[PDB]
Amino acid sequence: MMTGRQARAPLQFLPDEARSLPPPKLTDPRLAYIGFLGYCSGLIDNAIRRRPVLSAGLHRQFLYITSFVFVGYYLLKRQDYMYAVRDHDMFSYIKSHPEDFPEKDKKTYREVFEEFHPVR
Amino acid sequence: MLKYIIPTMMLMPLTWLSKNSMIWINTTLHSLLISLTSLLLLNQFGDNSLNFSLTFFSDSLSTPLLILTMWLLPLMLMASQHHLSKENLARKKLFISMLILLQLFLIMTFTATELIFFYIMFEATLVPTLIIITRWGNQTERLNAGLYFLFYTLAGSLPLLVALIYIQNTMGSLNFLILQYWVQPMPNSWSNTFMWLACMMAFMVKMPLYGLHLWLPKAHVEAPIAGSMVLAAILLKLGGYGMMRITLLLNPITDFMAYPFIMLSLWGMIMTSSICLRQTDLKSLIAYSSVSHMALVIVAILIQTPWSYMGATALMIAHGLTSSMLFCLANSNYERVHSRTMILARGLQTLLPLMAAWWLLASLTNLALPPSINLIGELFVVMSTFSWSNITIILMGLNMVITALYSLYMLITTQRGKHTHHINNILPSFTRENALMSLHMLPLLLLSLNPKIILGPLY
Amino acid sequence: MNLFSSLTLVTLILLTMPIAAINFNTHKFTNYPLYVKTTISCAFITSMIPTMMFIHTGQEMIISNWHWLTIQTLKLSLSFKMDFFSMMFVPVALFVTWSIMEFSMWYMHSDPNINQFFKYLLLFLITMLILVTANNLFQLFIGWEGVGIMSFLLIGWWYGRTDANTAALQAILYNRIGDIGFILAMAWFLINLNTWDLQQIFMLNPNDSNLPLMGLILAATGKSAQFGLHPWLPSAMEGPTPVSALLHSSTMVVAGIFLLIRFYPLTENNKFGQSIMLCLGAMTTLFTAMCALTQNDIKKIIAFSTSSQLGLMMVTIGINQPHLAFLHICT
Amino acid sequence: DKRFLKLLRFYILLTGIPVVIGITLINVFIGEAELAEIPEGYVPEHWEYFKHPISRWIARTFF
Amino acid sequence: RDHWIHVLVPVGFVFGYYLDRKNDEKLAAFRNKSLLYKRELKPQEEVTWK
Amino acid sequence: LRWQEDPEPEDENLYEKNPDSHGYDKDPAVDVWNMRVVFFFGFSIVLVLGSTFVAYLPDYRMQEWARREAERLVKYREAHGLPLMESNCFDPSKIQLPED
Amino acid sequence: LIRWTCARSANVYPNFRPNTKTSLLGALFGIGPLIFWYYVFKTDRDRKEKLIQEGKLDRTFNISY
Amino acid sequence: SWDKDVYPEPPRRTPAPSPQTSLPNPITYLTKAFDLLVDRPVTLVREFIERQHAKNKYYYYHREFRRVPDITECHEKDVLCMFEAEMQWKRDYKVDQEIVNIIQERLKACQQREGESHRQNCAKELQQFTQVVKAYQDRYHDLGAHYSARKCLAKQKQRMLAERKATKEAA
Amino acid sequence: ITKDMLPGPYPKTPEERAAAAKKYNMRVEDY
Numbered sequence A: 001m002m003t004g005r006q007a008r009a010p011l012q013f014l015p016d017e018a019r020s021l022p023p024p025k026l027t028d029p030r031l032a033y034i035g036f037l038g039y040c041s042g043l044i045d046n047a048i049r050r051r052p053v054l055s056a057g058l059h060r061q062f063l064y065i066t067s068f069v070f071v072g073y074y075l076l077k078r079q080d081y082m083y084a085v086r087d088h089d090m091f092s093y094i095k096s097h098p099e100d101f102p103e104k105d106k107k108t109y110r111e112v113f114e115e116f117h118p119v120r
Numbered sequence B: 001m002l003k004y005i006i007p008t009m010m011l012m013p014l015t016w017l018s019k020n021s022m023i024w025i026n027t028t029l030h031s032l033l034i035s036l037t038s039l040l041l042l043n044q045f046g047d048n049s050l051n052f053s054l055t056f057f058s059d060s061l062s063t064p065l066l067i068l069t070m071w072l073l074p075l076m077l078m079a080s081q082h083h084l085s086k087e088n089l090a091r092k093k094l095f096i097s098m099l100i101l102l103q104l105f106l107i108m109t110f111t112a113t114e115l116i117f118f119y120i121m122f123e124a125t126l127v128p129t130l131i132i133i134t135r136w137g138n139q140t141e142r143l144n145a146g147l148y149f150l151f152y153t154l155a156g157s158l159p160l161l162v163a164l165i166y167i168q169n170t171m172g173s174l175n176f177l178i179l180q181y182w183v184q185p186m187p188n189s190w191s192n193t194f195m196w197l198a199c200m201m202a203f204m205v206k207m208p209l210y211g212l213h214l215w216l217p218k219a220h221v222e223a224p225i226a227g228s229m230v231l232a233a234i235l236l237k238l239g240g241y242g243m244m245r246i247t248l249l250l251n252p253i254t255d256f257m258a259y260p261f262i263m264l265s266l267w268g269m270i271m272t273s274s275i276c277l278r279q280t281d282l283k284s285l286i287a288y289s290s291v292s293h294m295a296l297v298i299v300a301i302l303i304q305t306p307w308s309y310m311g312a313t314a315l316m317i318a319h320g321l322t323s324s325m326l327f328c329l330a331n332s333n334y335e336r337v338h339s340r341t342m343i344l345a346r347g348l349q350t351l352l353p354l355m356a357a358w359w360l361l362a363s364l365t366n367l368a369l370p371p372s373i374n375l376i377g378e379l380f381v382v383m384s385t386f387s388w389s390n391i392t393i394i395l396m397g398l399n400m401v402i403t404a405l406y407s408l409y410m411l412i413t414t415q416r417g418k419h420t421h422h423i424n425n426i427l428p429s430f431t432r433e434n435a436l437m438s439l440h441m442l443p444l445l446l447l448s449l450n451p452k453i454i455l456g457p458l459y
Numbered sequence C: 001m002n003l004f005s006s007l008t009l010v011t012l013i014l015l016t017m018p019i020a021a022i023n024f025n026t027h028k029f030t031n032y033p034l035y036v037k038t039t040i041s042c043a044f045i046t047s048m049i050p051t052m053m054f055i056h057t058g059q060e061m062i063i064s065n066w067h068w069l070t071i072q073t074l075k076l077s078l079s080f081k082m083d084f085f086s087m088m089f090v091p092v093a094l095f096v097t098w099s100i101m102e103f104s105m106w107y108m109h110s111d112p113n114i115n116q117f118f119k120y121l122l123l124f125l126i127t128m129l130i131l132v133t134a135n136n137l138f139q140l141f142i143g144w145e146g147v148g149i150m151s152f153l154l155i156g157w158w159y160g161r162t163d164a165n166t167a168a169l170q171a172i173l174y175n176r177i178g179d180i181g182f183i184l185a186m187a188w189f190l191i192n193l194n195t196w197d198l199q200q201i202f203m204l205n206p207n208d209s210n211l212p213l214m215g216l217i218l219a220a221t222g223k224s225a226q227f228g229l230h231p232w233l234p235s236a237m238e239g240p241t242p243v244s245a246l247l248h249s250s251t252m253v254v255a256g257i258f259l260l261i262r263f264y265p266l267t268e269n270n271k272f273g274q275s276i277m278l279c280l281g282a283m284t285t286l287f288t289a290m291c292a293l294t295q296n297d298i299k300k301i302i303a304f305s306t307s308s309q310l311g312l313m314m315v316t317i318g319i320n321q322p323h324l325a326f327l328h329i330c331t
Numbered sequence D: 001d002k003r004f005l006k007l008l009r010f011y012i013l014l015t016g017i018p019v020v021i022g023i024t025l026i027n028v029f030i031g032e033a034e035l036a037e038i039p040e041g042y043v044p045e046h047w048e049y050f051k052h053p054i055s056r057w058i059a060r061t062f063f
Numbered sequence E: 001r002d003h004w005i006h007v008l009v010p011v012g013f014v015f016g017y018y019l020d021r022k023n024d025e026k027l028a029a030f031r032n033k034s035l036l037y038k039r040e041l042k043p044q045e046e047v048t049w050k
Numbered sequence F: 001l002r003w004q005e006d007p008e009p010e011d012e013n014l015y016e017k018n019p020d021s022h023g024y025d026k027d028p029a030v031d032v033w034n035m036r037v038v039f040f041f042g043f044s045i046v047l048v049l050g051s052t053f054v055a056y057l058p059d060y061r062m063q064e065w066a067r068r069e070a071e072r073l074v075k076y077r078e079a080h081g082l083p084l085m086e087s088n089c090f091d092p093s094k095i096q097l098p099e100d
Numbered sequence G: 001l002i003r004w005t006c007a008r009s010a011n012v013y014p015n016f017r018p019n020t021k022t023s024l025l026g027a028l029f030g031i032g033p034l035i036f037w038y039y040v041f042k043t044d045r046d047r048k049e050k051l052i053q054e055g056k057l058d059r060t061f062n063i064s065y
Numbered sequence H: 001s002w003d004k005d006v007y008p009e010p011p012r013r014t015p016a017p018s019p020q021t022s023l024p025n026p027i028t029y030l031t032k033a034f035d036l037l038v039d040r041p042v043t044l045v046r047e048f049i050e051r052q053h054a055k056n057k058y059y060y061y062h063r064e065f066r067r068v069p070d071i072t073e074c075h076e077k078d079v080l081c082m083f084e085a086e087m088q089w090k091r092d093y094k095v096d097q098e099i100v101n102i103i104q105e106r107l108k109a110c111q112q113r114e115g116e117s118h119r120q121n122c123a124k125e126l127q128q129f130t131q132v133v134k135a136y137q138d139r140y141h142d143l144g145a146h147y148s149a150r151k152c153l154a155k156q157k158q159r160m161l162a163e164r165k166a167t168k169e170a171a
Numbered sequence I: 001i002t003k004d005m006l007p008g009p010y011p012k013t014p015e016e017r018a019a020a021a022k023k024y025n026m027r028v029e030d031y
């Protein structure tokens, strides 16, 4: 859909306009969930190699957590960028096509007739 | 809702870091603390629901289901710790993890503000239940049972998903609070007819509707005791909750779409109750009685009056407590004679008198003895269905005859008559067993003192 | 006022006190039957004071003391109707029950479960006075199903006997067939009159009262063992003799008759309901007195006797004489 | 059965007798609120719309 | 602590309770702005609820 | 013959090794503390304090308020000669009907 | 006893054959009463709805439903 | 106590005791025994508890909801206005429910109080009951379990179209 | 309990009728 939008400047994971956007906080709950997924990967890595699950290889568990948080931070940056691009294109298209988006006359319910259906 | 979701999740490190002799005690203790905490959901208002966030809310429909759900977990742990005593320790912790995970999915099934998140938690409940039945059920047929439970649900629920996404494309939202104000009337057409079926048939399977009920006397029978407790007490009520939410969007087409299903329920409660008169398996009898009781909840939701919704939510809470207690009583006899045949162990009041008193009280609540909330829900549904059509009292009243007849027959066969001579392993009732019966029966009887908290959002 | 209502509620709370004593126990009782019999003799004495001051002035009241539940326009309260029917039936029932329990201290002396027997007999008496003192249909239905359940538990007192269990379940079956009509009446009064209270039923006074009175007649046919729903009362002789003496002769089985006496402002304006009650009562009193002419079990003869007397009570309701029917109950 | 019933009554009464004694002392010595008209300019707290002290405490503490 | 495992579910309550209160400040756009409950602020008051 | 299988283990009686068993565990100290946890946190905490909590709910779903408010409105419109309730929920001056 | 309880439940469908007898009994006792109670309740509610919309059904004190 | 206008009672006329016999009735002796043995200790305990209440007096309030705009002057699908209109409608519906309950309590109290001449002497309470039940039925009946202010407004507009058509055809 | 003591299909040959009569602990002439 938006593939011609990111085709004049291809293969940019985060373009330069993405820096206009606020980055995800480090206490982002999505980023905390990705760190939790890294911790679960570290536990499964101890489990399949028959290491003691919570205790063995704390350096390896911490590199799992760190690597998932590291990749996931940039994935969340790109996610928020693409939804911001989606809304920017939507609003610029509505602003440039007023004949397709008229302001509908809102009626109050004193004029609005709705059919009544009795439950009896 | 996150003050309940996070302690329920903290039960997972609590069960996996506990000492091996402490995993029942610790999970029972802290699940009882979560259940005590669940009464803060009774901050309900006469006009507004208790709306926590964009994701979660709780009106007077979801609140008793939440309190019953959070109450059922310690009782399931007490019911299950004896027959899993010889189990491997990690499999025991995995069993407790499946119960905790099922509680976690249920409490945000009932509080899900948005309907597709309701759908995802609603269907997420399948996986721990399927695992509990097929892994810790006792017999061969559990595997076949796990298929029926899986595939009557999904075949009903995958058209719901599409239907909900269609509403997402039509209304722009699936927030139930937005849909309270943006609901448009659903006229008579074929498109809206299959819209109605896609919105309703997943919950018809969950209730179960008569004719769609066949998964239940396999799934509740072949399950272990905690599986049967949560299946009868909570997971049937996902269908009633989902109907009470989804029939907002289905007016006025419901006024003639309900006619076949009402027939299937009104005759179905005559059939399945009659089936209970000739059941040889006691646990199958309790399962068919659950189908018969949920038929009234189906009729009450489809006729959609205030009295019928009040009776249906009272009957859902009351049936949850009563059916869970009846499965626990049948399990207490199964853990002595190792057979679910009801005619096998007879005359048990001569051997086990206090457990016979628990059988008596659970039978009296099953036959809706006033003033139990069983009778409150039963009676209010009967009032509303009499107003719907005066002839229904026939099929209502005849049901209350047969409901009495199978309730006492169960009580006469197992408790009365002469004891079986060759059965000599009838141990005296453990403190755990009488405790389990009292933790079902005492809240059930105390709710008769103040039933307004289980009468739902339009009390 | 303050004497009448206080001693009214003291009679009922006093009856509930030995149930609380037997449920909160640790020891083997020093003659719990004597305690229950002393309690019921004292409740007879306490119930005689509102009866005397009804005989003096005609003093009647309603004690709606506890708001229980409001279903939008149906306020349900714990409500006690102290009128002529309660004022005469409560002392007669307490006097009869006091004799039944001093009889039971002899007759049931060999029974190892005599405390459970006196507990069940007192629970019957409590549910029967809930039935006869009720002001709304829900509380009357509590008393109604309560005397049905205590009837079950007391017919099947010797529960290893197959005939006792069969007779107890038969009594349940016929009474639930009558409860169909009870719940029909409750449904009609709620939908058409917006009430279960007797006062609004009598004040609205509906002319199209065929269907609720047919429901009440079906409920009395079940409860008072009229023809068609009669054989459970001769089957109920399978219980012990104090059960047959208290419940199945004098106190429980008049309840259906009592129900139609309670709704006499509706039956007096319905000649069709009067004719139905007249024909049903005459059919019952002929058939059961005819059955009693050849029986050999003495309790079966007395059971067909009292079902014939209940048929006579149904007759005198059917000739629009409800106070003679109530007098024949108390007699 | 007797041991179960003794332990059941013990653990119900263990908190129930202090709860009944405390409710009695609250009803006697603290006592119940009196209905009053709202003064001019006074904005009541949300727990001040309830009559019993335990209800006001629940409304102030939890709800 | 010798009984450190008995604080997992209670602190998970409190922290959960904390997050609920922390969410309320994110849903305070209509605080003292509803037509039903808008009012002038009392002295030494900055918000009508927290 | 058929394969190598453990025979059926006989069903254990918890009262044999522990005649004071509450049925929670075969270790008697764990059994007694499981009993105390179930009874204290189930009956002493949830049932008693929970029933006390429900008994003193602050006007659950504004029923009592609604009586008292009704006792205001009746008293306003008994005295002013107004009817106790109108058939119209909404003022007919603020309703446009579809003309015909 | 085990043989009886197995015959009553699990052996029934392996020994079911759809023929004239089982089809004519399964449709008489399975969908027959559904059609019957459908037409009874439908005729009753059509008659009652017609009486209410024609102002003939006495609904004077009916406010609970 | 309560307000004697919303819960009215006629003045009590009890007759003076005119004993014709020489036998003393037990009711006067039991009334004196109830006054001595029962009523005075209960009164003293209540006076003690009432002094303990008067030592610490505090107040609660009846919550006053101001009137927000109703559903007729809310724009269609405007959830912020029609939410408040819906909450106002639900509160008014709950209060109308309690008004019907008050009038039913008056009707039942009159039926017990007037006794055997209840049919003549309770015509005013019966008439008020009939008026308020007709108003409640026109306002809220047949809306269903999913009632709202929109359903009630649609019911009122249907009833007003029927009344306008009946007025037009009769002129 | 085992598989050849459970109920099975309808007996057609006389030896099948004989072995199912033996299974239900009764005579072939009575089965």
Ligand SMILES: CCCCCCCCCCCCCCCCCC(=O)OC[C@H](COP(=O)([O-])OCC(O)COP(=O)([O-])OC[C@@H](COC(=O)CCCCCCCCCCCCCCCCC)OC(=O)CCCCCCCCCCCCCCCCC)OC(=O)CCCCCCCCCCCCCCCCC
Binding pocket: C009, C012, C013, C016, C017, C020, C065, C126, C130, D012, D013, D015, D016, D017, D019, D020, D023, D024, D025, D027, D028, D031, D032, D052, F048, F051, F052, F055, F056, H041, H042, H044, H045, H048, H049
């Ligand atoms: C007692 C121990 C019981 C056992 C302990 C353990 C119990 C088990 C565990 C329970 C745990 C709690 C469970 C949750 C419940 C929480 C409490 C609650 O919700 O209370 C609700 C409710 C409201 O309490 P509240 O909101 O706190 O107070 C409202 C007031 O506005 C505010 O109150 P107030 O300020 O207006 O009143 C203050 C009141 C304090 O308030 C209380 O005590 C009420 C709280 C007690 C609640 C107890 C509930 C537990 C269950 C009790 C029932 C079962 C007991 C065993 C069985 C008995 C037989 C059945 O003061 C008094 O009590 C003192 C007055 C004493 C009068 C009698 C003596 C006078 C003469 C004395 C002469 C000698 C001295 C002369 C000189 C004196 C000089 C100074 O309280 C009650 O219902 C109290 C129970 C009694 C009710 C009336 C009983 C008679 C009714 C008869 C007719 C109706 C029934 C007909 C049946 C017919 C047969 C079928």
Ligand SMILES: CCCCCCCCCCCCCCCCCC(=O)OC[C@H](COP(=O)([O-])OC[C@H](O)COP(=O)([O-])OC[C@H](COC(=O)CCCCCCCCCCCCCCCCC)OC(=O)CCCCCCCCCCCCCCCCC)OC(=O)CCCCCCCCCCCCCCCCC
Binding pocket: B353, B354, B355, B357, B358, B360, B361, B364, B365, B369, B370, B371, B372, B373, B442, B445, B446, B448, B449, C022, C023, C024, C025, C078, C116, C123, C127, C130, C139, C142, C146, C149, C150, D005, D008, D009, D012, D016, F047, F048, F051
């Ligand atoms: C908030 C505060 C509330 C305080 C008040 C409590 C309110 C009710 C709560 C629930 C009470 C049930 C507890 C007893 C039954 C279960 C255990 C048992 O069987 O023990 C036998 C045992 C004594 O027997 P045993 O000789 O040692 O051995 C038994 C034998 O093996 C052989 O046994 P058996 O067959 O000879 O004897 C069993 C017998 C068998 O008798 C029957 O089955 C006949 C019952 C039905 C016909 C008669 C009643 C009909 C309805 C009228 C009553 C309700 C309305 C009354 C109002 C006026 C009208 C509107 O049952 C009884 O006598 C129980 C009396 C109460 C029956 C309640 C209705 C059950 C019927 C089914 C449902 C009906 C609708 C629900 C009603 C709910 C009312 C609140 O009892 C005890 O040791 C009691 C332990 C302590 C109980 C505490 C109860 C409260 C627990 C709640 C805790 C939290 C709040 C704190 C309150 C604490 C208060 C102290």
Ligand SMILES: CCCCCCCCCCCCCCCCCC(=O)OC[C@H](COP(=O)([O-])OCC[N+](C)(C)C)OC(=O)CCCCCCCCCCCCCCCCC
Binding pocket: B152, B155, B156, B159, B162, B163, B166, B191, B192, B194, B195, B197, B198, B201, B202, B205
């Ligand atoms: C548990 C077993 C039974 C389960 C039953 C589940 C429900 C049964 C009915 C499902 C119908 C299919 C989904 C409908 C979703 C409705 C969404 C919608 O907008 O509909 C209107 C739309 C209308 O199209 P539209 O909305 O795009 O058009 C615009 C609107 N108009 C019409 C005005 C121009 O309906 C459809 O497009 C088709 C609806 C019928 C679909 C028929 C194919 C499926 C048949 C039923 C299969 C059921 C499961 C089979 C498997 C059984 C077990 C193995």
Ligand SMILES: CCCCCCCCCCCCCCCCCC(=O)OC[C@H](COP(=O)([O-])OCC[N+](C)(C)C)OC(=O)CCCCCCCCCCCCCCCCC
Binding pocket: B371, B448, B449, C065, C066, C067, C068, C069, C076, C077, C078, C079, C136, C138, C139, F064
């Ligand atoms: C031995 C123990 C007794 C108490 C000992 C200690 C106290 C000593 C003596 C002093 C008395 C205590 C103070 C007065 C009592 C409290 C008074 C009071 O206002 O209480 C508040 C209220 C009075 O009612 P209310 O109308 O004020 O409030 C009810 C609450 N709303 C409005 C929300 C509905 O509650 C009670 O009094 C509760 C006790 C009721 C007693 C009867 C119980 C029957 C249970 C049956 C269950 C099923 C019923 C189904 C059928 C119903 C009918 C259809």
Ligand SMILES: CCCCCCCCCCCCCCCCCC(=O)OC[C@H](COP(=O)([O-])OCC[N+](C)(C)C)OC(=O)CCCCCCCCCCCCCCCCC
Binding pocket: B035, B063, B064, B065, B067, B068, B071, B317, B321, B443, B446, B447, B449, B450, B453, B454, C016, C019, C066, C067, C123, C126, D052, D055, F046, F047, F050, F051, F052, F053, F054, F055, F056, F057
């Ligand atoms: C709830 C949904 C999920 C279901 C499962 C939940 C399980 C989890 C458990 C959580 C805790 C328990 C929750 C439910 C609590 C219900 C109890 C409760 O709150 O009650 C409040 C009720 C409410 O009554 P109330 O409304 O009148 O209270 C008045 C309100 N105040 C107190 C503020 C003035 O409390 C009472 O009734 C207290 C009065 C005394 C108790 C009754 C005494 C008499 C009982 C019968 C005596 C014998 C009569 C004759 C019979 C003879 C023998 C048969």
